[PDB]
Amino acid sequence: DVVVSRWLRVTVAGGVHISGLHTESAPRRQQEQQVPILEKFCFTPHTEE
Amino acid sequence: KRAYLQARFPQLDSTSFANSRDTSFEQHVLWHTGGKGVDLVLNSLAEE
């Protein structure tokens, strides 16, 4: 079983016990980002002029 | 000493006391204050 206390800043589970954990945001920028193929869907006659 | 302080200062309550021989008072203060903390601190204490 695990418990989290925002007020006391503690995380206890079994024999472990963590206090004062500070986390800073990563840039979130990752390369090789997906490039979706965007398209439209329009009725097209056969004989165009 | 808790009894003496209670006798001298009636306005204090059972929740306004902690332990000075250990670091347990941090949890007490944080719990009873809602996690915000305290404004002024007067600290004649050691490293830990």
Which 3 state secondary structure label does DSSP give A7?
coil
Using the structure block, give the residue that is written with the tokens 């600290």.
B43
| Closest approach of B7 to chain A, Cα-based (Å) | 31
Contact list in B for residue A17 (CB cut-off 8 A) is none
State which approach was used to obtain the coordinates. Answer: cryo-EM
- Identify residues of B whose CB sits under 8 angstroms from chain A CBs: 27, 30-31, 34-35
Pair of tokens at residue B37: 């903390």
Contact list in B for residue A7 (CB cut-off 8 A) is 30-31, 34-35
Pair of tokens at residue B23: 């670091």
CB A22 within 8 A of CB A30: no
CA distances from B15 to A11, A27, B18, B19, B32 (A): 24, 44, 8, 12, 8
Residue of A nearest to B35 (CA): A7
In chain A, the DSSP E strands lie at 2-5, 10-13, 16-19
Residues in chain A, total: 49
As a whole number of angstroms, the distance between CA B12 and CA B5 comes to 8
As a whole number of angstroms, the distance between CA A32 and CA A35 comes to 9
CB A11 within 8 A of CB A3: yes
CB A18 within 8 A of CB A11: yes
CB B38 within 8 A of CB B29: yes
